Amino acid sequence: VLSPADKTNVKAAWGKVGAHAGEYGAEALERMFLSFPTTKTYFPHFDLSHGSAQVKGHGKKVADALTNAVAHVDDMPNALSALSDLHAHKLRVDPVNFKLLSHCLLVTLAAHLPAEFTPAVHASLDKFLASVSTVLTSKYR
Amino acid sequence: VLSPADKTNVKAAWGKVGAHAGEYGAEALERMFLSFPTTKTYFPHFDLSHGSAQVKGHGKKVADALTNAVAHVDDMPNALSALSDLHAHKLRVDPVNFKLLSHCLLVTLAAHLPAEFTPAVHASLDKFLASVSTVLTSKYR
Amino acid sequence: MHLTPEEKSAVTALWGKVNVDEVGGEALGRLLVVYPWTQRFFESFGDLSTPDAVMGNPKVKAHGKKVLGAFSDGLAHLDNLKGTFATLSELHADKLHVDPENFRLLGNVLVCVLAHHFGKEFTPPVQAAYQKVVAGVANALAHKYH
Amino acid sequence: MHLTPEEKSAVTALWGKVNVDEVGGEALGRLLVVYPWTQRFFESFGDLSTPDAVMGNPKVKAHGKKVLGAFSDGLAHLDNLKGTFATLSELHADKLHVDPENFRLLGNVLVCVLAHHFGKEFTPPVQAAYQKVVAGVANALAHKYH
Ligand code: HEM
Numbered sequence: 001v002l003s004p005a006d007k008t009n010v011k012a013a014w015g016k017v018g019a020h021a022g023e024y025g026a027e028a029l030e031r032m033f034l035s036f037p038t039t040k041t042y043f044p045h046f047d048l049s050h051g052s053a054q055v056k057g058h059g060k061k062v063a064d065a066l067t068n069a070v071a072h073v074d075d076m077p078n079a080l081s082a083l084s085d086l087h088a089h090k091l092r093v094d095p096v097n098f099k100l101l102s103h104c105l106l107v108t109l110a111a112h113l114p115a116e117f118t119p120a121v122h123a124s125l126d127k128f129l130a131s132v133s134t135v136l137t138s139k140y141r
Numbered sequence: 142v143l144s145p146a147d148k149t150n151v152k153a154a155w156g157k158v159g160a161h162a163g164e165y166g167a168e169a170l171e172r173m174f175l176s177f178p179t180t181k182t183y184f185p186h187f188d189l190s191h192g193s194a195q196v197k198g199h200g201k202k203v204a205d206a207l208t209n210a211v212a213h214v215d216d217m218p219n220a221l222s223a224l225s226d227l228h229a230h231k232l233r234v235d236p237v238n239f240k241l242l243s244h245c246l247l248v249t250l251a252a253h254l255p256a257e258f259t260p261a262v263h264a265s266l267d268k269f270l271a272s273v274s275t276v277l278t279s280k281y282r
Numbered sequence: 283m284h285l286t287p288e289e290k291s292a293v294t295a296l297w298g299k300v301n302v303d304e305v306g307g308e309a310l311g312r313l314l315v316v317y318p319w320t321q322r323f324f325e326s327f328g329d330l331s332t333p334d335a336v337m338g339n340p341k342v343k344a345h346g347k348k349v350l351g352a353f354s355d356g357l358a359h360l361d362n363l364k365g366t367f368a369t370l371s372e373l374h375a376d377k378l379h380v381d382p383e384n385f386r387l388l389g390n391v392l393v394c395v396l397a398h399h400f401g402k403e404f405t406p407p408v409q410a411a412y413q414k415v416v417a418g419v420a421n422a423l424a425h426k427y428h
Numbered sequence: 429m430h431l432t433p434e435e436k437s438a439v440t441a442l443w444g445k446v447n448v449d450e451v452g453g454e455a456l457g458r459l460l461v462v463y464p465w466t467q468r469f470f471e472s473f474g475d476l477s478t479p480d481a482v483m484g485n486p487k488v489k490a491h492g493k494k495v496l497g498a499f500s501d502g503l504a505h506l507d508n509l510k511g512t513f514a515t516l517s518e519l520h521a522d523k524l525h526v527d528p529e530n531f532r533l534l535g536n537v538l539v540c541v542l543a544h545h546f547g548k549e550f551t552p553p554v555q556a557a558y559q560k561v562v563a564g565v566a567n568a569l570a571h572k573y574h
Pocket residue numbers: 039042043058061062065066083087091093097098099101102132133136
């Protein structure tokens with residue numbers, strides 16, 4: 001459960017991401033693919049090569065959804081209904097993978113937002129990605 | 142979330158447990174100690190020998206809590222609050238261990254309720270233990 | 283694979299009693315029912331809409347038998363699972379694109395199936411031996427992912 | 429390890445630029461803050477009631493340095509982490525009762541600290557080699573649990 005401090009921390013940090021969220025989305029995917037190659041099993045139809053437009057494109061999509069999540073930090077379940085649906089009934093990504101992308105996203109934020117990636121902020125973003133993960137896998141069964 | 146069907150399944154299977162709950166609790170623990178030795182780090186103070194009274198004692202306590210969650214299947218967060226606090230603040234069991242115990246409880250029920258451990262019931266019991274674990278870990282951070 | 287001689291004897295003694303045809307169908311069906319997301323690989327199997335539709339599906343039964351068949355062979359080479367499973371690992375990775383977490387879910391379901399079938403005979407220590415085995419097989423099946 | 433000469437050189441080369449004193453203290457402290465339940469082993473350290481109290485706690489900082497120290501020396505036996513951490517593995521199991529899952533949490537925290545520190549330098553390929561090392565270390569440390 002995201003505390004008020006957490007919501008603030010998250011909104012702040014994501015605030016700094018700004019026009020780079022798409023690039024950060026793409027970078028987190030690339031880090032995921034290389035560090036946890038089992039994640040590639042869900043993207044057989046993608047060109048997973050460095051700088052691939054499919055990856056860039058997808059990176060944007062993910063980034064955008066996170067934005068929307070930050071914006072509705074108070075009503076995630078509702079802001080992400082459709083996405084929860086898609087993942088539960090179409091994509092059927094195994095739940096273990098959400099933790100992998102979440103980690104690659106922290107690593108990416110850390111590498112890009114040094115001043116802002118304080119221990120307290122690190123803690124909030126983690127919780128946040130965890131909540132988002134919970135929401136996305138809530139209708140699996 | 143547990144569906145009406147799930148609820149019926151759980152009350153039914155747990156119903157059959159009846160009076161053996163305690164013994165099945167102890168057995169699940171032993172299975173866990175034997176299959177996942179890392180879980181032993183939480184009971185340095187216990188006699189983990191076969192037929193240990195401490196294990197017997199502990200299995201009953203776990204079984205009572207499960208019986209209590211079944212009795213309050215529509216209000217588990219409240220029925221288990223106290224236990225949720227204890228685990229989050231005092232015991233501080235890493236979350237990954239809940240899945241291990243859950244698994245060993247499922248093996249135990251399977252081993253004892255052949256006629257009831259149907260695919261449908263298996264699925265409901267797995268969702269149930271996952272829900273209990275979620276409650277117990279909800280106040281961790 | 284830290285199977286003590288006694289752990290290996292125990293795996294082998296029980297495996298002697300198994301009807302792989304039967305266990306295979308049960309294990310695979312139960313996987314599709316407990317973790318419905320795993321159904322993503324079988325949209326050509328037809329109706330998997332309910333437990334009965336899954337459990338009785340002739341295609342699930344036949345596939346389960348195939349899977350357990352390869353697993354049984356694995357049990358005769360406990361010594362060299364990686365080698366034993368190499369071409370299958372490659373196939374699952376490169377052709378089938380099966381997330382290896384699926385191998386661990388099936389192992390757990392299989393353990394519950396053996397418990398279901400053997401009752402009291404599936405003692406704490408026998409389970410512990412089989413836990414090492416399903417993990418070793420999952421690991422061997424995942425060795426060729428890259 | 430299953431490190432590529434190229435992967436070995438990346439690890440090795442970045443490590444050379446690391447201040448173990450600072451990275452050790454930061455890694456352990458972030459651990460106690462992000463995953464509060466890990467504080468169960470450091471009650472004697474004092475007040476860990478806030479990020480600030482954790483990050484400022486000298487006992488935390490000094491333990492952090494001891495841990496990264498040991499880690500650092502393990503980078504010199506990358507081809508036998510098992511043997512390098514055998515005694516440490518026993519200690520952790522038999523004396524400290526630390527669940528090996530903590531080894532994995534720290535590893536991930538370590539990677540976030542390196543990314544934090546090195547920005548640009550900590551590229552996807554470089555993170556990949558470090559993920560392999562932290563997993564390797566965690567495995568080595570957990571090897572003697574029974
Ligand atoms: C942080 C949590 C995640 C978020 C917010 C997220 C968000 C999204 C979004 C916005 C889409 C695009 C929907 C569309 O095409 O209209 C999508 C699709 C997809 N996601 Fe998720 N995702 C997450 C986690 C994951 C993970 C961990 C994986 C697998 C490792 C995954 C696999 C996929 C795949 C395979 C697609 C479809 C790709 C395509 O065919 O274009 N997702 N996700």
